[PDB]
Chain length 122, copies 3
Amino acid sequence: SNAMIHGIGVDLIEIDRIQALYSKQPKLVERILTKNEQHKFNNFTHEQRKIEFLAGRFATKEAFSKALGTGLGKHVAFNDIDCYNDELGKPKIDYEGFIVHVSISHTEHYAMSQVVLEKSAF
Amino acid sequence: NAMIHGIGVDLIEIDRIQALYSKQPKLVERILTKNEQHKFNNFTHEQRKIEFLAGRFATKEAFSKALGTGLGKHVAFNDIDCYNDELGKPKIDYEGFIVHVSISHTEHYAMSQVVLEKSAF
Amino acid sequence: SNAMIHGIGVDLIEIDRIQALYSKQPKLVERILTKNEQHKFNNFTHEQRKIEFLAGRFATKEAFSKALGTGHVAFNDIDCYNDELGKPKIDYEGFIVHVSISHTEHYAMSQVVLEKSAF
Ligand SMILES: [Cl-]
Ligand SMILES: [Cl-]
Ligand SMILES: [Cl-]
Ligand SMILES: [Cl-]
Ligand SMILES: [Cl-]
Ligand SMILES: [Cl-]
Ligand SMILES: [Cl-]
Ligand SMILES: [Cl-]
Ligand SMILES: [Cl-]
Ligand SMILES: [Cl-]
Ligand SMILES: [Cl-]
Ligand SMILES: [Cl-]
Ligand code: NI
């Protein structure tokens, strides 16, 4: 085999900023979500969970876009990046041609995500 | 044919660890291996103690996430021995893999990242 | 055979500390930023952007240094530049360097992964 790292991305998001944005323009904020992510979001009852979810998605989607690079990836629509967790709780994103590695974390005030994209060299 | 087995990241609020340690010091110290406990027991400043604990929480959590095993295999925090190379670069050994670790902290936050790489052999 | 990871590094910086650095000791900037980075820093007209830039670069150099390990590089010899899409980049003989930077109002962070060169 001939694996190689294509690119990496990291993003840190201040949860309070996302709280403010969501209170002001909830529908505009929700446009970053895919249909699957929207379905999940619509089942939440509590605002704290809603904001954590959104903040985490902002962070992951940005980290992924940065890792991909290319004009194509820099300009990927956030609502076309479907983030999910596997049956073991590992965050994932499917993207043809790459093995996408993701990791997430959050605290009360911050959400952070990192992405590493690997590729076969040929 | 991946070269990377998994990655993990964790961010920890130091103040939360301060609170936890003040309330349940013994429970908190149980996250440490015997080797880590030996290091901890030599510290004389509280600030260093809390930073050490916060950094270990972050690193152990990042490592756990990089494993990608969910609730499928039980790994105790006191079975993840974070140590230093002779210059202080953080390390963790995990048979079958090459483990890469990096740690950073500020006054209020500790973070850690772990990458588990596939071994050639 | 697969490429190999030489090392990884991460760094988190509180922007207020960097604000204090610049205000109290602007000439320290010369020991941190490369000539190319200094050219960019000197052209900012908005102080908030200027401090964010410096914080991000400081974080990047610390992350790079951690990734390289010591088995030695001056901060003002580690040039992080950006490509035509904005992506931060560092060129360093013997390695493929991967870099990512992120900022919030109060924090800057950077991560670096050094991969071993072959082809
Ligand atoms: Cl933010
Ligand atoms: Cl709206
Ligand atoms: Cl909920
Ligand atoms: Cl979720
Ligand atoms: Cl926390
Ligand atoms: Cl106790
Ligand atoms: Cl001490
Ligand atoms: Cl800091
Ligand atoms: Cl400006
Ligand atoms: Cl340039
Ligand atoms: Cl970036
Ligand atoms: Cl950013
Ligand atoms: Ni594996």
